[PDB]
DNA sequence: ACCTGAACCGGTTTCTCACAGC
DNA sequence: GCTGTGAGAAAC
RNA sequence: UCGCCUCAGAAGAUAGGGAGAAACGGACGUAAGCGUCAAGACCACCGAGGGUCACCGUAGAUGAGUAAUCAUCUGCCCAUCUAUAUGGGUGGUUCCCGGUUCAGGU
């Protein structure tokens, strides 16, 4: 019983900048996860081929791989959460230390250089957790989708290999969930935003939606159907922000009940 | 960038700062 | 000037 | 009088940069690229940034806002459904369900 109210956003420069930073962060996390999986499976297939010279069955190799799930973790694949905890906030702390050691005078070239990493300065620790973990969501979904397509589950043609996303070749989009604060008419603002400096506290019309740490953003549509659905026993679930060419869209997933 | 084309599905929970509304 | 409430990180 | 791109979430009324004479064809600067400009109203700062509409027939009330605009009820009109000429109830031109990934063609 799920609908989707797809509004066309009407953001401004200060909000489009955060949207671009968000899609960049999701893409960057997507790339790290897919790379980790890719050069884990390269070793996987090299080992499988190098042990294929001697005839082996499928149960024996499965038992061996299961027994190799405690040591030499190079034979393991990670979800969004496990990879996040194990390799993302370590790198967030690495970025933080790279600022905690350039505070007032230091050598940044020995700490951060644009040779092995295309970042001008560290920025991964000042990125919102929701946006960052969205890329983990997408990458884990793609890899599980393909390993389900292979074995026995997904009907249709064989499904490719996960391709590294690029700026202008792939899709830009991130999902931000509840129980964060979001919604149409009848919802409160954010403390500290330029619309809270003026003191305004609640949405009292039909051309605004609430988008978490991004503030409250306008729409091209009208939210009267959304609010009239809300006052029947129906509550929003998440919001997905997406880009098409130079246009931004937001989907509000409502669950009527 | 613009589509098919198809196949599948639609987020919770907790602990720690910083105004705030007098 | 004080303490619940909101906003955001962290795990997951 | 016509219509190729451009602003109004998509199609039918009103605005945008230049042309054509119901036919053809986006523009400017610099065989090519590249960059840039194209919707009106109110306050805010020294041509730059932020909110409001570009959906809601027709008359009132008082709600939020320095204000553009907006909200909720009460009169009238029209359209649309059910139960037995009457009671109610739904609107003010209609439509909308979107995310993820890969393989293709343009």
Q: What is the DSSP letter of A84?
A: I
On whether the CB atoms of residues A204 and A240 are closer than 8 A, the answer is no
Distance CA A62, CA A45 (A): 14
Any atom of strand B under 7 A from CB of A177? Answer: yes
How many Å apart are A238 CA and B1 C1'?
Answer: 28
Directed axis angle between helix A129-151 and helix A13-50, to 10°?
40
Nearest to A61 by CA among A49, A70, A71, A73: A49
How many Å apart are A82 CA and C11 C1'?
Answer: 9
Distance CA A23, CA A240 (A): 12
SS3 (DSSP) at A178: coil
Any atom of strand D under 7 A from CB of A204? Answer: yes
The CA–CA distances, whole Å, from A36 to A2, A40, A82, A223 equal 35, 6, 13, 43
Nearest to A174 by CA among A4, A29, A3, A2: A29
How many Å apart are A240 CA and D93 C1'?
Answer: 31
Helix (H) / strand (E) containing A225: helix A224-230
How many Å apart are A12 CA and D6 C1'?
Answer: 20
Helix (H) / strand (E) containing A229: helix A224-230
Order of strands across the sheet with A208-211?
A: A182-183, A208-211, A216-218
Residues 185-204 of A with CB under 7 A from strand C: 188-191
Sketch the domain layout of chain A as residue ranges. Answer: 5-255
Any atom of strand D under 7 A from CB of A141? Answer: yes
Q: What is the DSSP letter of A241?
A: E
Cβ burial of A229 (10 Å; 0-12, 13-18, 19+) is buried
How many Å apart are A203 CA and D15 C1'?
Answer: 30
If phi > 0 it is left, if psi is from -120 to 50 it is alpha, else beta; for residue A194 that is alpha
On whether the CB atoms of residues A250 and A9 are closer than 8 A, the answer is yes
């Amino acid at each position: 019983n799920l609908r989707a109210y797809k509004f066309r956003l009407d953001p401004n420069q200060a909000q489009t900048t955060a949207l671009y930073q968000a899609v960049g962060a999701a893409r960057y996390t997507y790339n790290m996860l897919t790379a980790y999986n890719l050069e884990v499976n390269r070793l996987r297939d090299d080992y499988w081929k190098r042990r294929h010279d001697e005839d082996i069955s499928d149960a024996d190799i499965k038992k061996e791989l299961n027994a190799l799930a405690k040591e030499d973790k190079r034979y393991k694949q990670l979800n969004y959460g496990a990879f996040g905890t194990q390799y993302l906030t370590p790198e967030k702390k690495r970025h933080e230390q790279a600022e905690h050691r350039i505070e007032n005078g230091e050598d940044p070239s020995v700490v951060w250089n644009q040779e092995t990493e295309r970042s001008a300065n560290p920025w991964l620790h000042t990125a919102n957790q929701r946006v960052l973990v969205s890329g983990l969501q997408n990458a884990s979904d793609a890899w599980d989708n393909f390993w389900a397509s292979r074995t026995g589950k997904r009907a249709g043609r064989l499904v490719g290999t996960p391709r590294f996303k690029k700026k202008g070749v792939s899709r830009d989009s991130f999902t931000v969930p509840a129980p964060e604060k979001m919604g149409a008419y009848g919802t409160a603002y954010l403390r500290g935003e330029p619309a809270y400096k003026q003191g305004r506290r609640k949405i009292t019309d039909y051309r605004h939606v609430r988008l978490s740490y991004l503030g409250t953003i306008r729409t091209f549509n009208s939210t009267k159907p959304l609010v009239k659905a809300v006052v029947a026993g129906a509550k929003i679930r998440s919001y997905t922000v997406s880009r098409n060419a130079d246009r931004w869209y937001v989907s509000f997933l409502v669950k009527f009940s």
